[PDB]
Structures are given as structure tokens and as C-alpha cells.
Amino acid sequence: TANTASQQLSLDPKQRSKQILSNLKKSPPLNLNISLPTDLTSTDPAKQQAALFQVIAALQKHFKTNMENVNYDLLQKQVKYIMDSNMLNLPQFQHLPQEEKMSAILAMLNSNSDTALSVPPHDST
Numbered sequence: 001t002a003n004t005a006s007q008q009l010s011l012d013p014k015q016r017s018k019q020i021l022s023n024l025k026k027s028p029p030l031n032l033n034i035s036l037p038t039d040l041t042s043t044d045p046a047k048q049q050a051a052l053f054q055v056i057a058a059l060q061k062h063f064k065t066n067m068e069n070v071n072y073d074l075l076q077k078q079v080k081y082i083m084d085s086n087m088l089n090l091p092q093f094q095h096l097p098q099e100e101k102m103s104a105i106l107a108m109l110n111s112n113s114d115t116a117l118s119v120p121p122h123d124s125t
Contacts, residue, residue, distance in 0.1 A: 034062070049079065065121075
């Protein structure tokens with residue numbers, strides 16, 4: 001049994017979130033090594049958000065520079081996405097291993113322009 005061809009569709013983030021996860025592995029090899037505390041995937045929003053800001057902060061610095069600051073303005077966007085997406089609560093993502101989860105979270109974070117911080121710097125002389 002096999003499928004010849006099938007078109008994809010994505011209008012909302014909550015929906016696409018399921019598709020992106022299906023083709024998450026497609027993403028390139030990236031070793032973040034960012035632990036995922038239960039708080040991030042807690043049951044309440046308070047802990048969920050509180051943790052999100054943490055993981056995002058560490059990722060932001062490790063991305064731009066270890067001694068870099070924590071973009072709060074952009075954080076609201078990167079965090080908002082995950083919030084609306086509800087990936088943390090979503091079982092499809094909750095099933096993935098702490099390791100893969102990191103890739104999915106980051107990967108998806110690079111879906112919106114506002115949260116497109118994933119973009120690397122610009123080495124200049």
C-alpha cells in the first residue's frame with residue numbers, strides 16, 4: 001500500500017501545527033541541547049508561559065550570542081505563536097521526546113516573520 005500524491009493545506013496555526021510536526025524531521029540537523037521543563041508543558045497557562053519565556057530566552061542567546069541579551073519585544077511574538085498554536089497542550093507534540101520536541105518548537109517558531117529570530121547574524125568587517 002502506498003499513496004501516489006497528496007496536496008497539503010494550512011490556513012490556521014492550530015491546524016498547520018499538525019502538518020509541520022509530520023514533516024518536522026525534514027528540517028536540517030541542529031543541536032540545541034535545550035532541556036524542556038514540565039512547566040513548559042504544564043497544565044496551567046501561568047506555568048506554561050513562565051517556562052516558555054525561559055526556553056525562548058536561553059535559545060535566543062545561544063542563537064545570536066551566549067552573551068547576547070533577551071529580545072523581549074520579539075519574545076512576545078515567538079511566545080504568542082506557541083500559545084495560540086497550543087502545541088504545548090497538543091498531544092501530538094506532547095508525545096514526541098524531549099529531544100524532538102525542541103526541534104519541533106524551534107522549527108515552528110521559524111514559521112512567523114515576527115518570530116523569525118531564527119535568522120543568523122551578519123558577520124561584517
